[PDB]
Amino acid sequence: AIKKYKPTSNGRRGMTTSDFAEITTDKPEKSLLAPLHKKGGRNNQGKLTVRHQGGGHKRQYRVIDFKRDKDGIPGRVATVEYDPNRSANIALINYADGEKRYILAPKGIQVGTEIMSGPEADIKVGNALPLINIPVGTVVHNIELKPGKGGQLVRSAGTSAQVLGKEGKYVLVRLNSGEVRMILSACRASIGQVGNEQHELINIGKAGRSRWKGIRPTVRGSVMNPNDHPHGGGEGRAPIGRKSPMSPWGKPTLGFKTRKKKNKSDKFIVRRRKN
Amino acid sequence: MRKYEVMYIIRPNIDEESKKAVIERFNNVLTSNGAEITGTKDWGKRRLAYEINDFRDGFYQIVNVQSDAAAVQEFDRLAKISDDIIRHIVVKEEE
Amino acid sequence: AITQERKNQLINEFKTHESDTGSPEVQIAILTDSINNLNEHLRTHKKDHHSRRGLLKMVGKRRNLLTYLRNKDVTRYRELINKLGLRR
Amino acid sequence: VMTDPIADMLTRIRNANMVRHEKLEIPASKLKREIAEILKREGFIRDVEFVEDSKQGIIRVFLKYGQNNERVITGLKRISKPGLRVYAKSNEVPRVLNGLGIAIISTSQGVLTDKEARAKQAGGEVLAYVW
Amino acid sequence: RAKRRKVCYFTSNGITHIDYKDVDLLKKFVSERGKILPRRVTGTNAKYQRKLTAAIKRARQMALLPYVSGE
RNA sequence: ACUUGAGUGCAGAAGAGGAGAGUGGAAUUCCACGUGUAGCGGUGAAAUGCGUAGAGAUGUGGAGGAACACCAGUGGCGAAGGCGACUCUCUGGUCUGUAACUGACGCUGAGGAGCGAAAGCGUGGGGAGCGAACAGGAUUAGAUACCCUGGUAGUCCACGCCGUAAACGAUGAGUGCUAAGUGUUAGGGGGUUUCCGCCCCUUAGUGCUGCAGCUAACGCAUUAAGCACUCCGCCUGGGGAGU
Known part of the structure; x- marks a missing residue:
């Protein structure tokens, strides 16, 4: 949900923060916090090569399987937690191994749901399996490109994909924003559209929240x-x-147009960028 | 619960003992929710009018399940994406 | 609803006479419980105006019968109201 | 329903009063009873024979109007409206018609007629008026 | 006089079928080009044409009778 | 006190009544490739437009949206607006039948509450067909129109506001009575009928034809605009002015 603020001052007259109902606990796992340094748009030289970044609050990264290499052993969602490094939230998962892993949170989940990740696994929202076994037409996120690399593809809050119809190699995917890329078939993928769907309608309102994030x-x-x-x-x-x-x-x-014309993606598009 | 007389045909490209595995496992998943499925049937290789997925005719099937109320959506939705069951039309049974 | 275990079960748990299927305390019991279950079952998908008009007519009828039983017997109407829970 | 009983009986004797029916039903009550003895004794209908039984009712009168169209029930009007009641004192008990009809004011000693109620000289609720 | 030809067509030997397991009376009901039969030319009752029409649809959904025909 | 009113029960029947999810075809568009040539298209007659960059047509396959033909009918259901492919979950309501119970617990109801086609309005989705504004061509003296070729918003969805219509039967709701016929669904009792089927009686709903009665005339007429009762709302010449 999305609350709206009553205009107590002029900072407030449009601003919205999300309801924070999806989250359960505050203080995260100490044993998967990876430290961060806001870089500020800088280079390895020292020059600032990205305009108007910098200024943000102290982030702190939490380690995420964007792979789900482990398989078959069902998860059991303990908590769904908040991460300043991206739009969407993260669900903490206690596997039966004890391998407590922050893993990206699709919608419709709460505490207690079984999440397997084998190629045998279900199409219950959360379970993950390579694209051959996925039937034609499921809501899929967390797609990779090369097998086992990590979920570069779709991940951000309230996004999804499909599978239009496939061969042995490759598996066609209507991605988000309409690009139909012949994504490889043994690519591991996971099932569901990404939680916290109402990130877009968050009206920022006052000036310095874009400085809170931050953006110069x-x-x-x-x-x-x-x-x-x-x-x-x-x-x-x-x-x-x-x-x-x-x-x-x-x-x-x-x-x-800024794609390379001589480029590898000349074969890997059936349909691109509906505009 | 109530009677659910839902019968959805098996794919024509299936093998023999694999088709028996499909009826066996699918009957198990339909039977996991307490429904002693007191009916069965096998109408045989009978041609349909138009194609379902790729056949010009298929291996027809039937069912007779007596349960809730707990697994009609389970046996329909959990079998909607199988490769054997072409198009399962699980009609209610109140005749 | 109502389920038969609550129709015959509720009429069996609130029968005023030994063979009285009616007995407007019994009508307030069956109509009251069916109005409650229709209240949650209307709240589960809050757009259906038809079932909502049913909830308004049914809840109003149970109110009119509650006022009838309150006008028919005072202390027994207070005992039926405080035992049933609603009307507060 | 059941807005007024005496208006239901008066509408019964009216609608049957134009239908040319031999007998007429009614809802059996003390107003249909005493009004049946008054309106039958004054000579409009042939006979009221209140054939009672379980549970309630039910009077049954016959139209005492011969060949000539419009007999002794020639037209009836609700002189008292149950809903806005008529009233009539002793000196103001009005005799309806003038010389032909007769009104029936429910006196304090019984449902009288017009001239007999003026004979007692005491009025009450104007019960009905048969012009 | 005084009835319809093909008197009621299902009320004589019905009722309450079929639908899925039936393809026989469904074979005699769904018309020649492919459409459902007219309820004046076929001759069913009110409830007979209602049940045979609902079972004609619900038997057309599981691919039993064809959803279209030839010319 | 009592039972027909009204309600509960018991057993039946019925429906496009609703809300959510899923599924299915026919057709149009678009795309990919084959086949093929010089027209396709539209009209009152033409033109704009499309087509040798290979169109139309035809064959195959894919994507996507919207609506579900046949059944289908002055049929059904709903308070009304309205509601149609198919299946499931959750749910309201109506009528029939004996008749177990309750014993008038009812009718209307200004305010108040709630719903209300289509157009619109906010956001975010969806955009195959249709399509205001707009573009071109035609007809005319003129064409900010009719026609044709295109074409945005919209139609679609979810969430909120809008609360108007010839929102019509131009007929407020409830009840009782009062000639008849003929349909039509949803039931019931029955006369013989294993059947089936005919016929009567009976409800409930709905259509036609008409007696009494109403009326200014048209017309209504057991679904009254008849005959009476209860209650609410509205009306007091037109324009000005629903300003």
Whole structure:
């Protein structure tokens, strides 16, 4: 759910925080906290190569199977917990081994549900199995690309996929945003759309929450000096003067395609980017 | 509970003893919820009108299950994605 | 509902006379429990206006019978109300 | 239902009063009883024979109107409305019709007629009015 | 006079079927081109045409009678 | 005190009454590839548009949305708006039948509460067909229209607001009575009938034809606009002005 704040001051007049009903316990597992350093958009040189990051709060990473290499032994969801490193939440799972693993949380789960992960496993939301055994048309997330790499594919909050219809090799997938990629068949995948579906309707409201996260503010095109940004200039609020809008480098950023043309993904698309 | 007379056909590409395994295991999963399935049937290899998935005819089947109320959605939804059961139409039984 | 174990079970647990199927305390019992189970079963999917109109008509009828039993016997109506639980 | 009994009997003797039926039913009550003895004794219908039985009721009168269309029940009107009641004192007991009809005011000693109630000289609830 | 030809067609020897296990009276009910039969030309009752129509559908759902025919 | 009113029970019957989930086809569009050529399309007549970059048609396969033909009918159900492929869960209601119980526990009901087509409105999804605004061509003296070729929002879904309609039977609800016929579903009792089927009696619902009666006339007429009772709402010449 999503609460909304009464306008006690002018910071509050649009802002929303989510209800935090999905979460159960606060203080996480001490034995899977991996430490982090906010890098601030920097490089390994030291230059800041990503504009307007930095400023955030002290994050702390929690180790996640985006693989689910272990198999067959059912899980038993102990707690579903909150992680500042991403949109969606994480469910803590006590396997029967004792291998307490933070594993990404699909919706509809609570405490106590069995989660296997073999190729024999169910299509109960949470169970994970390679894409051959998945039937045509299930809600799938956590897709990988190369077998056993880790769930690069879909993961963020309130997203999903399908399986349109497959061969021995490969398995077609209507991914999110419509790209149909011939994803490899022995790729491990897990079942369900990703929990905390109402992340998008969170109205940020006050300015500094984008600084709380954080994101440094951005300075627009016809604001910087005509040196620094190739739109800036004029006698103030000049029109966006030069033809072909242009990034702060000399490349147009209305629709100029940026995929390599000679690239590996020329075969791995049946249908792309419905726009 | 109430009688659930649901009979969903087996795939025509199935093998013989594998088809007996499909009826055996599927009958077990239908029977796991206390329903002593007091009915059975095997209508045989009988051709249908249009294709189900790929056949021009299939190996027809029947059922007669007496349970809840607890496993009709189990035997329908848990068998909706099998490779043997072409299209199971689990009609209610109140005749 | 109601289930037969609550129809015959509830009428058997609240029979005013030895062979009285009616006896408006009994009608308030059966209509009351069926209104409660229709209240949760209406609350499970809160869009069905037809079943909701049934819940309003049924709950209103159980209220009118409650006022009838309250006008028919005072102390027995208080004992039926405080024993049943509702009306508060 | 059951808005008023005397209006149900009066609507019975009216609607049957135009139907040309031989006998007429009614709901058997003390108003149908005493009004049956008054309205039968004044000579409108042939005979009321209150054939009683379980559970309630049920009067049965015959229309005493001959060949000539419109006999001794020639038209009836609810002079007292159960819902907004009529009233009539001693000197104000009105004799309905003028010289033909007769009204039936429920006096304090029995359901009288018009002229007999004026003979007692005491009025009450205007029970019905048979013009 | 005074009845219909093909008198009621199911009320004489019914009732309460079929539906799934029946393909015989279903064979005599679903029409030649493929459509359901007209209830004036076939001759069923009210409840007879209702039950034979519901069992004609529910027997067409499990692929028993064809969902379309030839010309 | 009593039982027909009204309610409970017992047994029947019926339905597109509702809410949620899942499934299935026919058809259109689009896409991929075969086959093939010079037209396809539309009209009152044409043109815009599409087509040698290979269209239409035809064959195969795939994707997706929306609505479910036949049954289907002045049929059914619902308080009304309305509700249609099929299956399941949860649920309301109606009528029939004896008749176990209760013993008037009922009718209406201003406020108050709640629902209410389609258009709209907010957000987020979905966009196959249809399609305001818009574009082009046609007809006309003119065409901000009719027609045709396209085409956005919308229609679809979920969550909230909107609370209007010829929301119609232009007929508020409840009850009692009062000529008849003929249909039509949902039941029941019966006369013989194993059957089946005919016929009567009976309800309940609904359609036609009509007596009395009503009326300004059309018309209504046991589903009254008849005949009476209860209660609520509305009406007091038109425009101004539902301003």
